[PDB]
Design a protein around this ligand. Structure first.
Ligand SMILES: OCC(CO)N[C@H]1C[C@](O)(CO)[C@@H](O)[C@H](O)[C@H]1O
Ligand SMILES: [Cl-]
Ligand SMILES: [Cl-]
Ligand SMILES: [K+]
Length: 666
């Protein structure tokens, strides 16, 4: 059993349940590099100059992780600049790829530092404060083999309903039925395809989880049906924090049944978020999880078929303790007459109370009769919130797939939902960041993923949105979302709307292919997106390409991510057909040989490349997933080639039937 995977145990690790496969503890010396336990735990390895380091899922910078430091420590940080070491996810799987190749999964739920050539270029050092963890060593002939081994042992990836492969629109600010009707009309009257409209926090009654604003939605299920009859599915947000409010049932039940995270003394810990004071459900306690997940029935029973889980690092604006400290400091600053307390110090204290490391030491989880301080298991919170929801969906309607994705995650959560890449910005560099995160997420089990198209924060432009959308065409989550106070970012908010229709039409024409590749990959523990080096391992040029990706076994993508550009450079490791979805609805085709090329790609054109000896099916454009005609689709690509199409009803879980597969031959 499990010949290629060994598990090395130190101390008394918390069981994260990341793996579904039970691996016995190995008793031999750790097989690579050196282990030191003098400062807790450290693994140190000297890399060959040509080694590439893959992995880390949702983390900053590039596909090859060499040259920086990455700290797994789930953090609400809306400014994703190159210096940042921690974002929302903790995906502790890396692969050293070169003359000596192996994979490592560090199953540890707290702050874990990956110094990948930051300190010394030749040195990989992975460290944490406590030697209480399991480290899995995965052997294999190459990096792709090692990834496939890992994907097997962590269990099958979450599978969304097919409607989730349409286009979605959200904004922090949609509040009233008028707001949502205006979005529906803006897309539908302009014949821009769309399947989902996201409901952000203003839909709740005073930011209370599992409520709907009674003034704005007096007959909510009727409104849900108004939208669904037009093939628009409302996708509401749920937050980690439950508002403290007398008479609010979720709060009352959480208090009475000890379902919230508690302070040292047993009191329910207060964290301020959108509602002001909240309590956090104890996501690591199985009974609290069951209770919290069961609450989703409130929305499911009203016609809702999907959710997004947010603020689940968990994010904390301040604690009662931190607020009191900040106010005391402010009082001193206010009455200072000697000029001893400077404004910068006041500013620093205000910043310090937000997402404070000290607050994460102030509350506990109750697991199997043991109270564990939250910081010790910090990176498991979002994972378990989404597990709570996923497991509830199985109880509520076991036959049905729900759309589900989370901001914060840890390996293991990939069984229950996808992720979105959080609060990016309307920056050109964030198109590239979106692209690079994709294969790494796939290595860690997270295939239903994507970024806020157009950029969440700051102000977008028409061309940036168009280029973001052209990458989103290929990402399973394709959602335009934006922050409050930003320039309006719906496609209909710009001149020459036909260009937006053209780009989103390309998504819908590709949905049968993209869904098929997703399903084949998920059902077989394989990757939807792959780095070029996984497909062309013997090509020294290919292995270092980071701004192109392979999708499935048929195509390569290469989005434009430079402002004012009319094209871009590409490297083709084999002959391919360069394909563009054109704004008049036609599909242009050009054979390009192996090697370096500059390709022209206008703002309203969507490019891809079809590999030698392959073809893909392309449907006529439709405006919602339900209406896509998949009978006798056009086949684009090479004569003599075939394609195996996976197609099911997109709704249920009947995955293993021969009727789901059809061979198309060009
Ligand atoms: O992290 C907090 C904020 C940014 O201030 N962003 C989060 C909350 C939010 O702003 C309102 O619900 C939402 O729109 C974002 O998608 C989410 O990441
Ligand atoms: Cl209503
Ligand atoms: Cl041909
Ligand atoms: K924006």
């Amino acid at each position: 059993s499990n010949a290629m995977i060994r598990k090395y145990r130190y101390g008394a690790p918390f069981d994260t349940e990341a793996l579904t496969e039970k691996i016995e503890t190995a008793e031999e010396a750790f097989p690579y590099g050196e282990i030191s336990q003098k400062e807790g735990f450290a693994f140190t390895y000297i890399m060959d100059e040509d080694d590439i380091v893959y992995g880390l899922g949702e983390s900053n910078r590039g596909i090859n992780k060499r040259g920086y430091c990455y700290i797994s420590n789930c953090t609400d940080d809306p400014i994703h600049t190159e210096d940042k070491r921690s974002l929302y996810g903790a995906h502790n799987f890396i692969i050293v790829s070169g003359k000596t190749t192996f994979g490592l999964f560090f199953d540890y739920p707290s702050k874990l530092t990956f110094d990948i050539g930051y300190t010394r270029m030749d040195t990989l050092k992975v460290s944490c404060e406590n030697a209480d963890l399991d480290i899995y060593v995965i052997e294999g002939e190459n990096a792709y083999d090692i990834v496939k081994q890992f994907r097997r042992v962590i269990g099958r990836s979450y599978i969304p309903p097919k409607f989730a492969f349409g286009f979605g629109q959200s904004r922090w600010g949609y509040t009233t039925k008028e707001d949502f009707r205006a979005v529906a009309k803006g897309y539908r009257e302009n014949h821009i395809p769309i399947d989902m409209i996201y409901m952000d926090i203003d839909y709740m009654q005073d930011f209370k989880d599992f409520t709907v604003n009674e003034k704005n939605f007096p007959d909510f299920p009727e409104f849900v049906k108004e939208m669904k009859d037009q093939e628009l599915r409302l996708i509401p947000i749920i937050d980690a924090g439950v508002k403290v409010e007398k008479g609010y049932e979720v709060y009352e039940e959480g208090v009475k049944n000890n379902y919230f995270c508690k302070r040292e003394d047993g009191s329910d810990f207060v964290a301020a978020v959108w509602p002001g004071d909240t309590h956090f459900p104890d996501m690591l306690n199985p009974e609290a999880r069951k209770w919290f997940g069961d609450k989703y029935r409130f929305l499911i029973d009203q016609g809702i078929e999907g959710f997004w889980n947010d603020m689940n690092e968990p994010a904390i604006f301040y604690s009662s303790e931190g607020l009191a400290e900040a106010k005391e400091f402010a009082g001193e600053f206010a009455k200072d007459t000697e000029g001893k307390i400077h404004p910068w110090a006041m500013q620093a204290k205000m910043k310090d109370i937000v997402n404070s490391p000290e607050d994460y030491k102030r509350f506990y989880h109750n697991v199997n009769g043991k109270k564990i301080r939250h910081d010790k298991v910090h990176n498991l919170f979002g994972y378990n919130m989404t597990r709570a929801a996923g497991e509830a969906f199985e109880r509520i309607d076991p036959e049905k797939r729900f759309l589900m994705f989370s901001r914060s995650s840890y390996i293991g959560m990939h069984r229950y939902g996808g992720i979105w890449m959080g609060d990016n910005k309307s920056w050109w560099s964030h198109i590239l960041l979106n692209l690079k995160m994709l294969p790494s997420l796939n290595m860690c089990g997270f295939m239903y993923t994507g970024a806020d198209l157009g950029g969440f924060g700051d102000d977008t432009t028409r061309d940036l949105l168009l280029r973001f959308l052209a990458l989103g065409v290929f990402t399973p989550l394709m959602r335009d979302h934006a922050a409050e106070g930003t320039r309006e970012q719906e496609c209909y908010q710009f001149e020459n709307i036909e260009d937006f229709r053209s780009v989103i039409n390309a998504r819908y024409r590709l949905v049968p292919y993209l869904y098929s590749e997703y399903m084949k990959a998920a059902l077989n523990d394989d990757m939807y997106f792959k780095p070029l080096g996984f497909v062309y391992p013997d090509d020294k040029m290919a292995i270092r390409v980071e701004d192109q990706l392979m999708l499935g076994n048929e195509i390569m993508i290469a989005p434009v991510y430079e402002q004012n550009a009319r094209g871009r450079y590409v490297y083709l490791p084999e002959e391919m057909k360069f394909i563009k979805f054109m704004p008049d609805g036609s599909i242009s085709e050009e054979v390009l040989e192996k090697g370096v090329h500059y390709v022209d790609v206008a703002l309203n054109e969507v490019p891809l490349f079809i590999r030698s000896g392959k073809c893909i099916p392309v449907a006529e454009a439709a405006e919602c997933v339900k209406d896509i005609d998949t009978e006798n689709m056009q086949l684009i690509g090479y004569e003599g080639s075939s394609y195996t199409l996976y197609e099911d009803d997109g709704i249920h879980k009947d995955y293993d039937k021969k009727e789901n597969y059809r061979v198309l031959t060009k």
